[PDB]
Amino acid sequence: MDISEWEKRYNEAYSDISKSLKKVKGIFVAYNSNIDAIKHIYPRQIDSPADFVARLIISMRDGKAAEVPTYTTDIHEWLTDNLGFDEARMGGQAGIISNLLANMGIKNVIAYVPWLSKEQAEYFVDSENLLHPVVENGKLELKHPKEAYNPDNKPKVNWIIEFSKGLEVKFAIVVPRDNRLIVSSRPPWIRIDMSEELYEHLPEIGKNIDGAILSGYQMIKEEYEDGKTYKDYVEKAVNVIKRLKEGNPDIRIHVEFTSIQNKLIRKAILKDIVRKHVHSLGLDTVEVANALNVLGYEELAYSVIKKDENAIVALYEGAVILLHELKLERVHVHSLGYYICVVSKDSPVSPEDHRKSLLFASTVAAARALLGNINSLDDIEAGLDVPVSEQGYNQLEKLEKYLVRRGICTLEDFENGCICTPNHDVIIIPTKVVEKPVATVGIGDTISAAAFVSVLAKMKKK
Ligand SMILES: Nc1ncnc2c1ncn2[C@@H]1O[C@H](COP(=O)(O)OP(=O)(O)S)[C@@H](O)[C@H]1O
Ligand SMILES: O=P(O)(O)OC[C@H]1O[C@](O)(CO)[C@@H](O)[C@@H]1O
Ligand SMILES: [Mg+2]
Known about the structure:
Blueprint: H1 6-18, E1 27-30, E2 34-40, H2 49-62, E3 66-70, H3 76-82, E4 87-91, H4 93-103, E5 109-112, H5 118-121, E6 130-136, E7 139-143, E8 157-163, E9 179-185, H6 196-200, H7 202-207, E10 211-214, H8 230-247, E11 252-256, H9 263-273, E12 280-284, H10 285-295, H11 298-305, H12 311-325, E13 330-334, E14 338-343, H13 351-370, H14 390-406, H15 411-416, E15 419-420, E16 425-430, H16 443-457
Parallel strand pairs: 1-5, 1-10, 2-8, 3-9, 5-6, 10-11, 11-12, 12-13
Antiparallel strand pairs: 2-4, 6-7, 8-9, 13-14, 14-16, 15-16
Helix pairs in contact: 1-13, 4-16, 8-9, 9-10, 10-11, 10-12, 11-12, 13-16
Bound molecules: 5'-O-[(R)-hydroxy(thiophosphonooxy)phosphoryl]adenosine, 6-O-phosphono-beta-D-fructofuranose and magnesium ion.
PDB class: transferase
Keywords: ancestral protein reconstruction, enzyme evolution
Assembly: monomeric
């Protein structure tokens, strides 16, 4: 059943997208930057080490990627001496995406972070593509991160413990698949916010860009020390989105969702700031269930997190509901062997061009695995040598047999990757997976970011 024509679709997509990546004016990427600390190997937050080991055991028996936060530096000095990290890389949704797009030659990459530190600026690439906004003397100044940063700000470091093959140790029992645990520092001084002056010059920033990639809203707490609610930061998160559209009407705005422990913050994010002011959303199989658990579809959410064969068809239905419940124009869910992107019929980009974006995003993710990171637009070309994962092609077979028997799409339509339903459209591709990747943090942000910028390029709104 496996047709070798898919290798031809990847090749003709890379050249067509790379030749269009000059059509984008700029991108605005904001709110998430930290320094990862990779360590080589029911509690809701980490206050004492007994909680850290407990949350590690959950990841050791499910193989699920769980992100849990710490608020005090009481355990920063705990691990830093008891357990030495071996590598420190650029981390955060906005940070990785800022480096990726700059390394791709995307023009006018505008990266903003509230906590910009002296140690943090050294991790950003040095190029005319990547610039940070500082509003000094009442006017908009886009200066390099190396220089326009605040000295009083101290860095934000996160601990990442990753492991594979499930090397087991019994205490007083083997990890199924590869899994990583993220211990994120959320000190009281970091806030998802921006200066009042930079909040004023947002129409200027929007007029010189074509898209915005926003992520990091999980830093918002319910209660603050200065007596401010999560609704204010939720309100400000929208008004920043609003003022960007006031300088550009045709700007598309993407939000890269992430695992959020607090369901009340998770729901307030999906309902108050993503529902109507956002067009694009990026997810993974586990976050779709997370999104359903707050919108009111837990039966389907449990079906997504379940292990049966019909879990993928639940992931399909989960993506469709997220596209309609949230009034979204695009939903990009990325899995290990395949991508699933459901798109509205209002989409300013045809389903034919939606496929090339996913094929390109799949080409970028493979090169991201082989090379430590990507340094040029031509480096992505290396990603075409990774073979298409047959496991991903066979996972779609369970979904294909379910869709052609339901009567939604044609057998021809699925083998090509373009399904046209009466109210929405779906694009499905098998991705390219490396047996021995070099680094596996950031691959997710890279898929949605590379796919999102490829859409703005091929947009006829130019
Ligand atoms: N070897 C390899 N080769 C190609 N592509 C890969 C590979 N490994 C993973 N992937 C992708 O990473 C995604 C996880 O991103 P996720 O959002 O879950 O993680 P982060 O938020 O840390 S970037 C997963 O859905 C896969 O499509
Ligand atoms: O929510 P936080 O603490 O910024 O962590 C975001 C995580 O996402 C990553 O960018 C991986 O996608 C890591 O660098 C980081 O651990
Ligand atoms: Mg992710």
